[PDB]
Coordinates of C-alpha atoms in Angstrom, one line a residue:
Chain A
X7 CA 5.3 42.5 18.7
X8 CA 6.1 42.9 14.9
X9 CA 3.6 41.6 12.4
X10 CA 6.0 41.8 9.3
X11 CA 7.1 39.7 7.9
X12 CA 3.7 37.9 8.2
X13 CA 4.8 34.4 8.6
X14 CA 6.5 35.6 11.8
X15 CA 3.5 37.4 13.1
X16 CA 1.9 36.4 16.2
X17 CA -1.4 34.9 16.3
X18 CA -4.6 36.9 16.3
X19 CA -8.4 36.0 16.9
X20 CA -10.3 36.5 13.6
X21 CA -14.1 36.3 14.0
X22 CA -15.0 34.3 10.8
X23 CA -13.3 32.3 8.0
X24 CA -14.4 35.4 5.8
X25 CA -15.6 38.8 7.6
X26 CA -16.1 42.3 7.0
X27 CA -14.9 45.5 8.7
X28 CA -17.8 45.4 11.0
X29 CA -16.8 41.9 12.2
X30 CA -19.7 40.4 10.4
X31 CA -19.4 36.7 9.0
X32 CA -19.4 36.7 5.3
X33 CA -20.9 33.3 4.1
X34 CA -18.6 30.9 2.0
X35 CA -21.4 29.7 -0.1
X36 CA -20.9 31.9 -3.0
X37 CA -17.9 31.8 -5.6
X38 CA -15.0 34.4 -4.9
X39 CA -15.3 35.3 -1.4
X40 CA -11.9 34.6 -0.7
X41 CA -8.6 34.3 -2.5
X42 CA -5.4 32.4 -1.5
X43 CA -2.2 34.5 -2.4
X44 CA 1.0 32.6 -1.7
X45 CA 4.6 31.9 -2.6
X46 CA 4.2 28.2 -2.5
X47 CA 6.9 25.9 -1.2
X48 CA 7.8 22.5 -3.5
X49 CA 9.8 19.7 -2.7
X50 CA 11.2 16.7 -4.7
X51 CA 7.6 15.0 -3.9
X52 CA 5.6 17.9 -5.3
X53 CA 5.7 17.2 -9.1
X54 CA 3.9 14.0 -10.2
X55 CA 3.8 13.2 -14.0
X56 CA 1.2 11.0 -15.4
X57 CA -1.9 11.2 -17.5
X58 CA -5.2 11.1 -15.2
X59 CA -8.2 11.5 -17.6
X60 CA -11.4 11.9 -15.2
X61 CA -9.7 13.3 -12.1
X62 CA -11.8 14.1 -9.2
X63 CA -11.6 15.2 -5.5
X64 CA -13.9 13.4 -3.3
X65 CA -15.7 14.5 -0.3
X66 CA -18.3 13.6 2.3
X67 CA -19.7 10.6 -0.5
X68 CA -19.4 12.8 -3.7
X69 CA -16.8 14.7 -5.7
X70 CA -16.0 17.5 -7.9
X71 CA -14.4 16.9 -11.0
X72 CA -11.2 18.1 -12.5
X73 CA -9.2 19.0 -15.9
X74 CA -7.6 15.8 -17.6
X75 CA -3.9 16.5 -17.1
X76 CA -0.3 14.7 -17.1
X77 CA 1.2 17.2 -14.5
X78 CA 0.3 17.3 -10.9
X79 CA 1.4 19.6 -8.3
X80 CA 1.3 19.3 -4.4
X81 CA 2.5 22.6 -3.2
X82 CA 2.7 23.8 0.5
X83 CA 1.2 27.4 1.0
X84 CA 1.7 27.2 4.8
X85 CA 4.4 29.6 5.4
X86 CA 3.8 32.6 3.2
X87 CA -0.1 31.9 2.1
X88 CA -2.7 34.7 3.0
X89 CA -6.5 35.0 2.1
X90 CA -7.6 38.3 0.9
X91 CA -11.3 38.8 1.0
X92 CA -14.0 39.6 -1.5
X93 CA -13.3 42.8 -3.3
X94 CA -16.5 44.7 -2.3
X95 CA -15.5 44.2 1.4
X96 CA -12.4 46.2 1.1
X97 CA -10.4 44.1 3.8
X98 CA -7.8 42.8 1.9
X99 CA -5.6 40.5 3.7
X100 CA -8.0 39.2 6.5
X101 CA -6.3 35.9 7.2
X102 CA -2.8 34.2 7.3
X103 CA -2.6 30.6 7.2
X104 CA -1.8 30.7 11.0
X105 CA -5.3 32.6 11.8
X106 CA -7.1 30.4 9.4
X107 CA -6.3 27.4 11.6
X108 CA -9.3 29.1 13.8
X109 CA -11.6 28.2 11.0
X110 CA -10.2 25.7 8.8
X111 CA -11.9 22.9 10.6
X112 CA -15.3 24.7 10.7
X113 CA -17.3 22.0 8.6
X114 CA -20.4 24.2 9.1
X115 CA -19.1 26.7 6.2
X116 CA -20.1 25.7 2.8
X117 CA -16.9 26.0 1.3
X118 CA -15.1 23.4 3.7
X119 CA -15.6 19.7 3.1
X120 CA -14.4 16.6 4.5
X121 CA -11.9 14.7 2.1
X122 CA -13.0 11.4 1.3
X123 CA -10.6 9.0 -0.3
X124 CA -13.3 6.7 -2.0
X125 CA -14.7 9.0 -4.4
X126 CA -11.4 10.7 -5.1
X127 CA -10.5 9.3 -8.5
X128 CA -6.8 9.7 -9.0
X129 CA -3.8 7.4 -9.3
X130 CA -2.8 5.4 -6.6
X131 CA 0.7 6.8 -6.1
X132 CA -0.7 10.6 -6.6
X133 CA -3.1 9.7 -3.6
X134 CA -0.3 8.3 -1.5
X135 CA 1.7 11.5 -2.2
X136 CA -1.1 13.7 -1.1
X137 CA -0.6 11.7 2.4
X138 CA -4.1 13.1 3.6
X139 CA -6.6 11.5 6.0
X140 CA -10.5 10.9 5.5
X141 CA -12.0 13.8 7.0
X142 CA -9.3 16.3 6.2
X143 CA -10.7 19.7 5.2
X144 CA -10.8 20.3 1.4
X145 CA -12.1 23.2 -0.4
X146 CA -13.0 23.8 -4.0
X147 CA -10.8 26.4 -5.5
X148 CA -10.3 27.6 -9.2
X149 CA -7.4 29.7 -10.7
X150 CA -7.9 32.9 -12.8
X151 CA -8.5 30.6 -15.9
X152 CA -10.9 28.9 -14.2
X153 CA -8.9 25.6 -13.7
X154 CA -10.5 23.7 -10.7
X155 CA -8.2 23.0 -7.9
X156 CA -8.2 21.9 -4.2
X157 CA -6.7 23.2 -1.0
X158 CA -6.4 20.8 1.4
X159 CA -5.5 21.1 5.3
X160 CA -3.3 18.1 6.1
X161 CA -4.0 17.7 9.8
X162 CA -1.4 15.3 10.6
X163 CA 1.3 17.9 10.0
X164 CA -0.7 21.1 10.1
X165 CA 0.1 22.1 6.3
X166 CA -2.0 23.8 3.7
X167 CA -1.7 21.7 0.6
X168 CA -2.7 23.3 -2.8
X169 CA -3.2 20.6 -5.3
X170 CA -3.4 21.5 -8.9
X171 CA -2.8 20.5 -12.4
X172 CA -0.5 22.1 -15.0
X173 CA -0.5 21.8 -18.9
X174 CA 3.3 21.4 -19.1
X175 CA 6.2 20.4 -16.7
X176 CA 6.7 23.1 -14.0
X177 CA 10.3 22.2 -14.1
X178 CA 12.5 19.8 -12.0
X179 CA 12.7 23.1 -9.5
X180 CA 9.3 24.4 -10.4
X181 CA 11.5 27.3 -12.3
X182 CA 8.9 27.0 -15.2
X183 CA 5.7 27.9 -13.0
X184 CA 4.3 31.3 -12.8
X185 CA 1.7 31.0 -9.8
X186 CA -1.8 32.4 -10.5
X187 CA -4.2 33.5 -7.8
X188 CA -6.8 31.0 -6.6
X189 CA -10.3 31.9 -5.8
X190 CA -13.1 29.8 -3.8
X191 CA -15.4 28.0 -6.4
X192 CA -18.9 27.3 -5.2
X193 CA -20.0 23.7 -5.1
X194 CA -23.0 24.7 -7.5
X195 CA -21.0 26.6 -10.1
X196 CA -19.7 25.2 -13.5
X197 CA -16.8 26.7 -15.1
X198 CA -18.5 29.5 -16.8
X199 CA -20.5 30.1 -13.7
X200 CA -17.2 30.6 -11.7
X201 CA -15.6 32.9 -14.1
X202 CA -18.9 34.9 -14.5
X203 CA -19.3 35.1 -10.6
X204 CA -15.6 35.8 -9.7
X205 CA -14.5 39.4 -9.1
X206 CA -10.9 40.4 -8.5
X207 CA -11.0 44.2 -8.4
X208 CA -13.2 46.4 -6.2
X209 CA -15.3 48.9 -8.0
Chain B
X6 CA -1.2 43.8 18.6
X7 CA -4.0 43.6 16.1
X8 CA -3.0 43.4 12.3
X9 CA -5.8 41.9 10.4
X10 CA -7.4 43.4 8.6
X11 CA -4.2 44.3 7.1
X12 CA -5.6 47.8 6.0
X13 CA -6.2 48.8 9.4
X14 CA -2.9 48.0 11.0
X15 CA -0.7 50.1 12.6
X16 CA 2.6 51.1 11.0
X17 CA 5.9 48.8 11.6
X18 CA 9.1 49.9 10.8
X19 CA 10.5 47.8 8.1
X20 CA 14.1 47.5 7.8
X21 CA 14.6 47.8 3.8
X22 CA 12.6 47.7 0.9
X23 CA 13.2 44.0 0.4
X24 CA 14.7 41.9 3.5
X25 CA 15.3 38.5 4.8
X26 CA 14.1 36.3 7.7
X27 CA 16.1 38.4 10.2
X28 CA 15.7 41.9 8.8
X29 CA 19.0 41.9 6.4
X30 CA 19.0 43.9 3.2
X31 CA 18.3 42.3 -0.1
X32 CA 19.3 43.7 -3.3
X33 CA 16.4 44.9 -5.9
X34 CA 18.5 44.7 -8.8
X35 CA 17.5 41.6 -10.3
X36 CA 14.1 40.7 -11.5
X37 CA 11.5 38.8 -9.1
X38 CA 12.9 40.1 -6.0
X39 CA 9.4 41.4 -4.9
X40 CA 5.9 40.5 -5.9
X41 CA 2.9 42.9 -5.5
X42 CA -0.3 41.2 -4.6
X43 CA -3.6 43.0 -4.2
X44 CA -7.2 43.2 -4.9
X45 CA -6.9 46.9 -6.7
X46 CA -9.5 49.4 -6.3
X47 CA -11.2 50.9 -9.4
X48 CA -13.4 54.0 -10.2
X49 CA -15.0 54.8 -13.6
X50 CA -11.9 57.0 -14.7
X51 CA -9.8 53.7 -14.2
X52 CA -10.4 52.5 -17.6
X53 CA -9.5 54.2 -20.8
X54 CA -9.6 52.9 -24.2
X55 CA -7.5 54.3 -27.0
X56 CA -4.8 52.3 -29.4
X57 CA -1.3 53.3 -28.5
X58 CA 1.3 51.5 -30.6
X59 CA 4.6 52.7 -29.0
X60 CA 3.6 53.3 -25.3
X61 CA 6.5 53.9 -22.8
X62 CA 7.2 55.0 -19.5
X63 CA 9.9 57.5 -18.9
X64 CA 12.3 57.7 -16.0
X65 CA 15.4 59.8 -15.3
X66 CA 15.6 61.0 -19.6
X67 CA 15.2 57.5 -20.5
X68 CA 12.3 55.0 -20.8
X69 CA 10.9 51.5 -20.7
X70 CA 8.6 50.0 -23.7
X71 CA 5.2 48.7 -23.0
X72 CA 3.2 46.5 -25.2
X73 CA 1.0 48.2 -27.9
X74 CA -2.5 48.2 -26.5
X75 CA -5.9 49.7 -26.5
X76 CA -7.2 49.2 -23.0
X77 CA -5.6 51.0 -20.4
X78 CA -6.1 50.7 -16.7
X79 CA -5.2 53.1 -13.8
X80 CA -6.0 50.9 -10.7
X81 CA -5.5 51.8 -7.0
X82 CA -3.4 49.3 -5.1
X83 CA -3.4 51.4 -1.8
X84 CA -6.0 49.6 0.4
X85 CA -5.1 46.0 -0.2
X86 CA -1.7 45.8 -1.7
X87 CA 1.1 43.9 -0.3
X88 CA 4.6 43.0 -1.3
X89 CA 5.8 39.0 -1.2
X90 CA 9.5 38.6 -1.0
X91 CA 11.5 36.5 -3.4
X92 CA 10.6 33.0 -2.9
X93 CA 14.2 31.7 -1.9
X94 CA 14.1 33.9 1.2
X95 CA 10.8 32.3 2.4
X96 CA 10.1 35.6 3.9
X97 CA 6.5 36.1 2.6
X98 CA 4.7 39.2 2.9
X99 CA 7.2 41.6 3.8
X100 CA 5.6 45.1 3.3
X101 CA 2.0 46.7 3.3
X102 CA 1.7 49.8 0.9
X103 CA 2.0 51.7 4.3
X104 CA 5.1 50.1 5.6
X105 CA 6.4 50.5 2.1
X106 CA 6.1 54.4 2.3
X107 CA 9.1 54.1 4.3
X108 CA 11.4 52.9 1.2
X109 CA 9.3 54.1 -1.9
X110 CA 11.3 57.4 -2.1
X111 CA 14.7 55.6 -1.7
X112 CA 16.0 56.2 -5.1
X113 CA 19.2 54.2 -4.0
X114 CA 17.2 51.2 -4.6
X115 CA 18.1 49.8 -8.1
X116 CA 14.2 49.0 -8.6
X117 CA 12.9 52.9 -8.2
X118 CA 13.2 55.6 -10.6
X119 CA 12.2 58.9 -10.8
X120 CA 9.2 59.6 -13.3
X121 CA 9.9 61.6 -16.4
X122 CA 6.8 62.9 -18.2
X123 CA 9.1 63.9 -21.4
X124 CA 10.1 60.2 -22.4
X125 CA 6.7 59.0 -21.2
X126 CA 4.8 58.5 -24.6
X127 CA 1.3 57.9 -23.5
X128 CA -1.4 60.6 -24.7
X129 CA -2.5 63.6 -22.8
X130 CA -5.6 62.0 -21.4
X131 CA -3.8 59.1 -20.1
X132 CA -1.3 61.5 -18.5
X133 CA -4.1 63.5 -17.0
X134 CA -5.6 60.7 -15.3
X135 CA -2.4 59.4 -14.0
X136 CA -1.7 62.8 -12.3
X137 CA 1.9 62.4 -11.8
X138 CA 4.4 64.8 -10.8
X139 CA 8.0 64.5 -12.3
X140 CA 10.2 62.7 -10.0
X141 CA 7.6 60.5 -8.2
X142 CA 8.6 56.7 -7.8
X143 CA 8.0 54.4 -10.6
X144 CA 8.9 50.6 -10.8
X145 CA 9.2 48.5 -13.7
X146 CA 6.9 45.5 -13.2
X147 CA 5.5 42.7 -15.3
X148 CA 2.6 40.1 -14.8
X149 CA 3.2 36.4 -15.0
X150 CA 2.8 36.7 -18.8
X151 CA 5.8 38.8 -19.1
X152 CA 3.4 41.8 -19.9
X153 CA 5.1 45.1 -18.7
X154 CA 3.6 47.6 -16.6
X155 CA 4.3 49.9 -14.1
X156 CA 3.8 50.7 -10.4
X157 CA 3.7 54.4 -9.4
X158 CA 3.5 56.3 -6.2
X159 CA 1.9 59.3 -6.7
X160 CA 3.4 61.5 -4.0
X161 CA 0.7 64.1 -3.9
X162 CA -2.0 61.9 -2.4
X163 CA 0.2 59.1 -1.1
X164 CA -1.5 56.6 -3.4
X165 CA 0.1 53.5 -5.2
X166 CA -1.0 53.3 -9.0
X167 CA -0.8 50.1 -11.0
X168 CA -0.8 51.0 -14.5
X169 CA -1.4 48.4 -17.4
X170 CA -3.0 47.4 -20.2
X171 CA -5.2 44.6 -21.0
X172 CA -6.1 42.6 -24.3
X173 CA -9.9 43.4 -24.0
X174 CA -12.3 45.6 -22.0
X175 CA -12.0 45.0 -18.5
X176 CA -15.8 46.0 -18.1
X177 CA -17.4 48.9 -16.9
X178 CA -17.4 48.0 -13.5
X179 CA -14.1 46.0 -14.0
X180 CA -16.1 42.6 -13.8
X181 CA -14.2 40.9 -16.7
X182 CA -10.7 41.5 -15.2
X183 CA -8.9 38.6 -13.5
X184 CA -5.9 39.9 -11.8
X185 CA -2.3 38.6 -12.0
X186 CA 0.4 38.7 -9.9
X187 CA 2.9 41.4 -10.7
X188 CA 6.9 40.8 -10.0
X189 CA 9.7 43.6 -10.2
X190 CA 11.3 43.5 -13.8
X191 CA 14.9 44.6 -14.1
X192 CA 15.6 47.4 -16.2
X193 CA 18.5 45.4 -18.1
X194 CA 15.8 42.5 -18.7
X195 CA 14.2 41.9 -22.0
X196 CA 10.8 40.0 -22.0
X197 CA 12.5 36.6 -22.3
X198 CA 15.0 37.4 -19.6
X199 CA 12.2 38.5 -17.4
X200 CA 10.2 35.1 -17.9
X201 CA 13.6 33.0 -17.7
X202 CA 14.6 34.8 -14.5
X203 CA 11.1 34.7 -12.8
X204 CA 10.5 32.3 -9.9
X205 CA 7.3 32.3 -8.4
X206 CA 7.6 29.0 -6.3
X207 CA 10.2 28.4 -3.4
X208 CA 12.1 25.0 -4.0

């Protein structure tokens, strides 16, 4: 019936992970073809404080490197999360986290990889907090500053987990953190390439 | 039944400008009760380069100050814009720009003011591009860095215009600009208060 508020909207078929107004598939190979917008949710387990100097996220193995940091955040974007399409498309919000379930396990999409613990170079305690299973979907992302991050789908509890570091304490209640948009980051892009490629405004 | 992509969705009644999980009214007096998320649309006329040292936005005659700047942006958020509700609500996206038309002219809402040209200190060229009418809705906003901005509803063509400055040229095709989230900024808040009050994560 109602579709607003969006978290309450009924499921709808969406043709592809990213699609245009003609219903055609838009490949996820390029940087910036989808944007994650959300009010993330945090719990007492979200904030992890320890310096990790050569952090990585592993996938099926190989990996993508992350910036060294002391503040690690495991946030849930399942309830309010939406994906905006690449700006040239004009599609705006073209998935909710619920509709995205139709495509999150589509390993054929270049953006989506299978999580691999073995090449994930993170503290033991942090891996424990992530509570992921080998093969869970993982997506390379970056914020608007080019700070690499990962979006996971934790299949065991059907939660979309946004994992990223911050330069400073986000606060015990996450009061300090002012969230940024996250955009998909191609596996072949360096940080400079990601920033150069990224568009956030339709022209 | 079909609401994605969102720009195409049929209008739906929404009870209030901001509302909770069961449709009850939420006051807009405080900072950070709503968030504008969009992929804005730009044209050649969107970008204006001139240094303005004491820029202000006037409303009914009084005003709110903006940061001194030389790069001015008049962007259209009608196509993809949505409003997320305050994080404590867990309500997520609760208006589209189309549904928002139901409430945008509700001057009883504390967040919404009537635009007044007389106390708006910007030059003729900028005012000409804004193309506003006295009394058009204006909302004081800020980005996640606490940079004050204005969201306007130009009643004449029913377009939502986001007006803000940048520190550098966004580019001829807006290629350089990486958009930030914008949150409502209470008329009684200083920049420090806006940043202190603002929450972008639910705990």
